Amino acid sequence: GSGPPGPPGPPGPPGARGQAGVMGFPGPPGPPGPPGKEASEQRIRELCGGMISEQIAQLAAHLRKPLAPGSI
Amino acid sequence: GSGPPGPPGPPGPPGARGQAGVMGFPGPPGPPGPPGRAPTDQHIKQVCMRVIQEHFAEMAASLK
Amino acid sequence: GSGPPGPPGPPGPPGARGEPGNIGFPGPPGPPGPPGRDATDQHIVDVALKMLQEQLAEVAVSAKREALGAV
């Protein structure tokens, strides 16, 4: 082999890309919802005023002290 | 003296594997829960009815 | 004259290091929070009792003013 060694070979291929990053963690639960909205005093008065009047009148009659006559 | 150079060498080996990628960001918080329940008109009436019925003795005292 | 060609050359250098891995995907959202608490009956009871006290008290006022002729 009187002649010199041949030229070096070409560079090898670049290495493989690294392992992909894993998916992030799940987020936390959200906060509890708002508390239920309370009925207004006015709506309660609308819905219950009549029954209170009726039951007061019926009880007055039971006790033999019936009242001022009520609205027709 | 010499003779011709030899043939070219083989390709080098592959490069080293890259570093692992970063983890993704965490997900966002979930939404707020649903609102609590508000009273229905029928429910309001029923509570009122119960209150009246549990106070007949007190009513009677003021109607005697 | 010439001797024979030389031996093959040396292997080439290793390749460049690989690039870093791809970025991870974002995580899922969390679940919705728990429901808010329902409105309790207390506020309704409180107003019903106020109304009862009011109307009962008016029965006495009514009787008094009837006797006075000043309703």
Numbering used by the authors:
A (entry chain C): 1 to 72
B (entry chain A): 1 to 64
C (entry chain B): 1 to 71
Copy out sentences from the published article reporting this entry, exactly as the authors wrote them.
Two host-guest collagen peptides (GPP)4-(GXY)4-(GPP)3, where (GXY)4 sequences are from the α1 and α2 chains of human type I collagen, were recombinantly linked to chains A, B and C (corresponding to α1, α2 and α3 in collagen nomenclature and omitted here to avoid confusion) of the NC2 domain in the following combinations designated as α1Aα1Bα1C (for short 111), α1Aα1Bα2C (112), α1Aα2Bα1C (121), α2Aα1Bα1C (211) and α2Aα2Bα2C (222). The most important observation is that the triple-helical chain stagger is entirely determined by the NC2 domain.
Whereas the crystal packing for 111sm and 211sm are similar (two trimers per asymmetric unit), it differs from that for 121nat or 121sm (one trimer per asymmetric unit). An overall superimposition of 121nat and 121sm (r.m.s.d. of 0.35 Å) confirmed the identity of the two structures. The most deviated pair is the first trimer (chains A, B, C in the asymmetric unit) of 121sm versus the second trimer (chains D, E, F) of 111sm (r.m.s.d. of 3.01 Å). Namely, a triple helical chain linked to chain B of the NC2 domain is always in the leading position, the one linked to A is in the middle, and the third one linked to C is in the trailing position. We suggest here to use a rule of BAC-translation: chain B is leading, A is middle, C is trailing. Despite the variations of composition (homo-trimeric for 111) and stagger (121 or 211) that might not represent a native stagger, the regions of sequences derived from type I collagen are well structured.
